[PDB]
Every structure is written in C-alpha cells, then in structure tokens.
Design a protein around this ligand. Structure first.
Ligand code: NI
Ligand code: NI
Length: 257
C-alpha cells in the first residue's frame, strides 16, 4: 500500500498518513546561506567502539544493518541532543543514476545516496515508544558521492547478493560503522520526521556537511537489489528517496561557521 512507484509513491502517502502534510516533515533542502551557526550546540559525540552489528535485512524498501540496542554499546550524544541515543540500524537511500538518490539536498544539490544511522532516546525504553515522542529519534545523515571506493562499505556491498529480495536477511556480525563516517563531524540540524510511512514527527536530524565517496561499482551493487519478494516480478530497488518537503516554521542550525 506504499512504495516508490508512480502509483504508490510519495505523492500518495498523505491519503493513508495525513501527517505527510505536517509541520515538521523530512527531508528538506538545506539552504547553506540561510542556516545559522548555533553557539548553544555542544560538541557531537559518536561512541561506536562497542557496537554489535547482528544482521542485514532487505525490508522491501531498503536494507537495514541492525545492531544490538539492548545496552549502550553504540551511542550518539551531544550536539543538539539532550541525553543518550542508541544505534538501532543504518540504511541508505539511493538513486537509479548518480545525479539523484539523496533525501536531503544542499542548495538544491542531490547526492547519489544518503546514509542514515538511526538512534533512539534511551529515556523512552524502546524504539517503538521513542517514535511516539517529538525527541524520540536522532538520525545521523551522511551524503554519498561517487568517486573513490569507501573501504569500510565493501563488507556491506558484498553481502547484498544474499539479501536480494524483500524479506531476506543474513547474519552480519562484527561490522564497524565507524568505517562509514567522513573525517569531519560538522553538521546541520533541524527537527523533522521519518521519511517513510508512518512519517512520524519524532526525529532530530543531524546531517553531516562532508560527504563520503563510494565507487561506481559499490553504488551499482545497491541498484541490483529488488523491492519485490522472491518469485514476484523483479523491480529494481532504486530511487527509494522521498523528495524535499516544505521547511515551514523551522530554522536549520549549523555547528560550524
Ligand atoms: Ni503496503
Ligand atoms: Ni532513512
């Protein structure tokens, strides 16, 4: 009842999820000239040394690399955040062509893909309770451009053949998400939402300014995944991004001058 086709894509979602037309929807265009430096921000702290990856799942819209979120093993703190946010999964959004695929844009520029590291606020006990809160989630967003390979991405790419179709999963232990981060942690932040149904307005977005580079071959492997289940007609998993939504009564803050 939802996806990324013409018949069931972003422009239809509001019929089932009227929050699609809400006051704090994501993604947005980041107007770099209008974002303002915020001195009240604290330094970002990414603490991923004890991360425990478990599994990779094709859920029919993306693939998720899932983590053990039953302890504070991989946590995000600081920046705009109050308290501790635990990493639950990461996934990507990507295009059919290198010129589109990101959900956020920067001065209207689209990247080839966007990495989302999803974290939930431990004051709410579990993810399902967190998504019902305005400060429930913190998503670290990282743009991908095509250029050199990203070495720390290769282990992800090479398991994708084993999860081609919706509902397939594979063991995915001992993956280090630190190998997906750029050098700088400079960022933009704003209050927003999930970008997939149910579109809940529960996310503090933290979007890094510095993209990571991946190779042609790496992105091409994303594009070989399928939205469909095994034994259904093949539909390539591409263009699984929601376009930019109205900023409305929000200000985007920058961590840097
Ligand atoms: Ni459906
Ligand atoms: Ni996402």
């Amino acid at each position: 009842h939802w996806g990324y086709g013409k018949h069931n894509g972003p422009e239809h979602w509001h019929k089932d999820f009227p929050i699609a037309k809400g006051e704090r929807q994501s993604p947005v265009d980041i107007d770099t000239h209008t974002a303002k430096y915020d001195p009240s921000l604290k330094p970002l702290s990414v603490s991923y040394d004890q991360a425990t990856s478990l599994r990779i799942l094709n859920n029919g819209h993306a693939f998720n690399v899932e983590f053990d979120d039953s302890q504070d093993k991989a946590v995000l703190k600081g920046g705009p955040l109050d308290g501790t946010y635990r990493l639950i999964q990461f996934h990507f959004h990507w295009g059919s062509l290198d010129g589109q695929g990101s959900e956020h844009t920067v001065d209207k520029k689209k990247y080839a893909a966007e990495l989302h590291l999803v974290h939930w606020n431990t004051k709410y006990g579990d993810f399902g309770k967190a998504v019902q809160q305005p400060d429930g989630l913190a998503v670290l967003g990282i743009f991908l451009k095509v250029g050199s390979a990203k070495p720390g991405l290769q282990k992800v790419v090479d398991v994708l053949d084993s999860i081609k179709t919706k509902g397939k999963s594979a063991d995915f232990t001992n993956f280090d998400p630190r190998g997906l981060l750029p050098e700088s942690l400079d960022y933009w932040t704003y209050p927003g939402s999930l970008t997939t149904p149910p579109l809940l307005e529960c996310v503090t977005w933290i979007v890094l300014k510095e993209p990571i580079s991946v190779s042609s071959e790496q992105v091409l492997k994303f594009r070989k995944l399928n939205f469909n289940g095994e034994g259904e007609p093949e539909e390539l998993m591409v263009d699984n991004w929601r376009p930019a939504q109205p900023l409305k009564n929000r200000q985007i803050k920058a961590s840097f001058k």
